[model samples]
Target: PQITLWKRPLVTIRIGGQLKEALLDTGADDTVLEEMNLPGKWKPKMIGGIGGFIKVRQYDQIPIEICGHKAIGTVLVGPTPVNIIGRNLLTQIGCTLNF
Candidate 1:
């Protein structure tokens, strides 16, 4: 079986009481929210992946409003060069990628 995936341009989202831009990747399984901009009180959890168990922290859902649509979802708090908008959030917009 084969799976069809979609892609979109990087969108800027507001987080950590600030506005930040991130690439929206439909291939990603989860929404990646960088820890560097995250607020305190978020707890880290150990997630098992191809590289064994890695500790990842969970943070409060930031208010995400895109193109007049808004939603709140779980974010993986981590230090990443850029934040990623995964399928979880992109799917809500019903977007189609040109590239």
Candidate 2:
């Protein structure tokens, strides 16, 4: 979907059968979601953000439907201000920023 940067590129994404809004952050290396209960084993991981580094639970091969496109990859669950869909999943969904 072509989006204008005039506003935040927020889009609805479905994960774990739940729907929520997320930002398409091209700067982020991985998709980070707000703390939530997901059924499966997750590994503790540390990742860098704008403020600082934070610990998160890494859930691999998680299926998420972004807008309408489906993608499967690593999803990090942690105490984030908002959900961010990063380049990792963005590449899978073929998201591109154009002028």
Candidate 3:
């Protein structure tokens, strides 16, 4: 499916039995979400972005559904400006930027 880039590519995603909206950011290398409780062990990590680097909790092998497409990968939980679905998960969902 082709999508227009007139606006930010925001989509609905399901994770940890919770539904939330996220942006499909091809520039991001890893998925990042707002602070939320997920069932599993997480390690403290840091990631850099537009503002600066911030601490986050890394959860690996987390199952998520992006627009009904299921995928399993690492997700970072922290104080993000917005929920983002990065290339890591986007590749699994087969999202591509085509003009």
Candidate 1 stretches greater than 4 Å from native: 1-8, 36-41, 46-54, 97-99
Per-model TM values vs. the true structure: 0.64, 0.95, 0.94
**Better model by lDDT, 2 or 3?**
2
Candidate 3 stretches greater than 4 Å from native: none
Write model 2 residue lDDT over 10-83, tens digit each, in one string.
99999878999999999999999998998789999999966889999999999999989999999999999899
Per-residue lDDT of candidate 3, residues 1-99 (tens digit) = 666788988989998779999999999999999989988999999899878899999999999999889999999999987999999999999998876
The segments of candidate 2 whose C-alpha lies over 4 angstroms from its true place after superposition are: none
Best candidate per lDDT, number?
A: 2
Residue 83 local lDDT, model 2: 98
RMSD of each: 5.6, 0.9, 1.0
**Model 2 misses residue 58 by how many Å?**
0.4
Q: What is the overall TM-score of model 2 with all chains considered together?
A: 0.95
lDDT-better candidate, 1 vs 2:
2
